[PDB]
Amino acid sequence: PHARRALCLLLGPDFFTDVITIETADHARLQLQLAYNWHFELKNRNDPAEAAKLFSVPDFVGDACKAIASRVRGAVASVTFDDFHKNSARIIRMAVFGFEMSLPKARDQAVFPQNGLVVSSVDVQSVEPVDQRTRDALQRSVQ
Amino acid sequence: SLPKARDQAVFPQNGLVVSSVDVQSVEPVDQRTRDALQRSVQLAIEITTNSQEAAAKHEAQRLEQEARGRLERQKILDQSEAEKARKELLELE
Amino acid sequence: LAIEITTNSQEAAAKHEAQRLEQEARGRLERQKILDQSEAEKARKELLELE
Amino acid sequence: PHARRALCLLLGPDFFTDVITIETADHARLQLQLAYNWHFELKNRNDPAEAAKLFSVPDFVGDACKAIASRVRGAVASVTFDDFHKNSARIIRMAVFGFEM
Known part of the structure; x- marks a missing residue:
């Protein structure tokens, strides 16, 4: 909730x-690591209103992380384990920014209007599932 | 907007607008709604290992019958050539 | 029992799907067996002409 | 996450x-080593904007490694072990830069 503290707001990617x-x-509890390639977007980098809108939310990192986590889990809890293992990256990326502007791919921008934080992309690192029963009982599958 | 409602949860008393709501973990605390649903996931992957091995078994039977199907082609063709040669063999005999 | 009627419901549906796939696989195996036997009878035609 | 530290940004291949x-x-957990032949590209090597855009991301090595790893694993988790052993290099290379040109 409150771990780091700094005087500078990192705007770089x-x-x-x-x-x-x-x-x-399927009720299979699994944990997974995410990346959240993000950056701040300021079209007019001298205007006091937009410039101060960056510091609107005081914990933008936590806000973005929790919002994306909620959206991802809400979309995942409606699909089976097999689907979330085949289209693991596809459905998670569709979840983060669910729309259609390109079945069809949505877009390439996850924008938060409150502070101008745009999550450029989302990356998944490891589908863990922690429970030892979703562990090496799937190992009998590979055998 | 079945259908989605809106994007504003406003309290008129003080002007506090809940912009959005996010859920983090469906816990259920009781140990019986706990790992008795865990037997479900064991059967949820069991109906997958069985499903993939059944499909593999079906493919193996398809390949085995195809291989036996072509072996029947070759056996009959070779026997036809043998009968061809047996024609002149029986002429000579 | 509220989750038991769910694990049973999802495994019954999985069992039904497996039977559907098994019958479809057996259905196509019956297609291939008959077709291969038809080709075998085709060749047996000239085999029996020669015989 | 943060192991090395340097004053110079290596641009060479x-x-x-x-x-x-x-x-x-098939749920077969496997680890694999990668190379990532990389290089920085600057079309106009005096412009302040593009030149300073190099130091935009502070951990470009880690960013590239994690992005490529995520993309590779996302594409691999949709193919069987036999496929990832026959076309091991083919599908991983298709995964890193999936397109058709």
Whole structure:
């Protein structure tokens, strides 16, 4: 909730090595690490209103992480484990910015209007599932 | 907007607008809604290992019958050539 | 029992799907067996002409 | 996350001896080492904007490694072990830069 503290608001492109604990429609509890390639967007970088709108939310990292986690888990809990293992990146990316402007791919921008934080992209790192029973009982499958 | 409602949860008393709501973890605390649903996931992956091995078994039967189907082609063709040669063999005999 | 009627419901649907796939696989195996036997009879036609 | 630290941004062609832990569609957990032959590209090597855009991301090595790892594993988890052993290099290379030109 409150771990780091700094005087400078990092606007450059970066990422959050966040891990979430989600559950699928089959009730399989699994945790997964995310990246959240993000950056701040300011069209007019001298205007006081827009410029101060950056510091509107005091914990923008946590806000973005929790919002994306909620959206991802809400979309995942409606699909089976097999789907979330085949289209693991596809459905999570569709979840983060669910729309259609390109079945069809949505877009390439996850914008938060409150502070101008645009999550440029989302990356998944490891589908863990923590429980030892979703662990090496799937190992009998590979055998 | 079945259908979605809106994007504003306003309290008129003080002007506090809940812009959005996010859920983080469906816990259920009781140990019985706990790992008895865990037997469901064991069967949820069991109906997958069985499903993939059944499909593999079906493919193996398809390949085996195809292989046996072509072996029947070759056996009959070779026997036809053998009968061809047996024609002159029986002429000579 | 509220989740039991769910694990049973999802495994019954999985069992139904497996039977559907098994019958479809057996259905196409019956297609291939008969077709291969038809080709075998085709060749057996000239085999029996020669015989 | 933060191991090395330097004053110079290496722009020359190099590689990252990174290893990933991915999983296939059969749920076979496997790890694999990658190279990532990379280089920086600057069309106008005096312009302040483009020139300073190099230092936009502070951990470009980690960003590239994690992005490529995520894309590779996302594409691999949709194919079987046999496919990822026959076309091991083909599907991973298609994954890193999936397109058709």
